[model samples]
Target: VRCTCISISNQPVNPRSLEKLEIIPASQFCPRVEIIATMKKKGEKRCLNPESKAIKNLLKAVSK
Candidate 1:
């Protein structure tokens, strides 16, 4: 059996006061699974680059 714990906290905070949590039902074997997770903060927004205008326009035409 195996377990994993990840701690993420806001900056400039003491570790003792920070709330900690762990993932349950962890993988029992090594390399049990390959996980890819993205962390995005609230209210985060992004736009396509202007250099991709040609590709974006092509997609628009195809969708119409």
Candidate 2:
């Protein structure tokens, strides 16, 4: 059997904490999954591209 997990950081702020729900996977069981997060500053839009870059780098390094 194999297992996988996800970690997120700097999630967007939303009423009802709906943004927090993004961390939860749609499916409870899966060997592989996708994790997404975001970063934000005061007066700036909440976004995740910066975090995605890190994931891309990690994948590149591991693929080597």
Candidate 3:
């Protein structure tokens, strides 16, 4: 119940459309790590695949 994401998306979205990025680490409630992205125009949110290189690059940029 503490988990924020129930499912994840394998398809990646346009990086320019992203307004916010949320990287949720794995926990006891949710064993898998989750990457949540918020769209700039629609203000909608979706989960990103952790295995994707695009997401990994984005994570690195944001982390710094």
Candidate 4:
């Protein structure tokens, strides 16, 4: 037998209150697209490198 489950955080938060969206994809409506935030949310603190820098730069691209 085998059991698998989706990443909990990646799932839409389905609470009984405080939401206007019906069913929104987190990936669609989020700043952090990838590279995971549960480990650490700060690029500076992560101190990774160009990848981190690229992710940081994504913020600029996100603006209209």
In the range 1-64, model 1's lDDT, one tens digit per residue, is 4323143222322122211211122244422221111223333222211123332332233234
Global Cα RMSD, each model: 18.0, 11.1, 3.9, 14.9
Distance from true location, Cα of 3 in model 4, Å: 25
Question: How do the residues 1-33 of candidate 4 rate in per-residue lDDT, one tens digit apiece?
Answer: 211212322212111111221221233433233
lDDT per residue (tens digit) for residues 14-55 in model 3:
434456767667566655445676756578777653545555
Off by over 4 Å in 3: 1-7, 12-16, 27-33
What residue runs in model 4 are displaced by over 4 Å at the alpha carbon? 1-51
- Steric collisions counted per model: 0, 0, 0, 0
Pitting candidate 1 against candidate 2, the one with the higher lDDT is 2
All models: lDDT? 0.25, 0.30, 0.56, 0.24
Residue 44, model 3: Cα distance from true site in angstroms: 3.5
TM-score of 4: 0.19
lDDT score of residue 30 within candidate 4: 38
Pick out the ten consecutive residues of candidate 3 with the lowest summed lDDT.
Answer: 8-17
lDDT of 3 at 37: 68
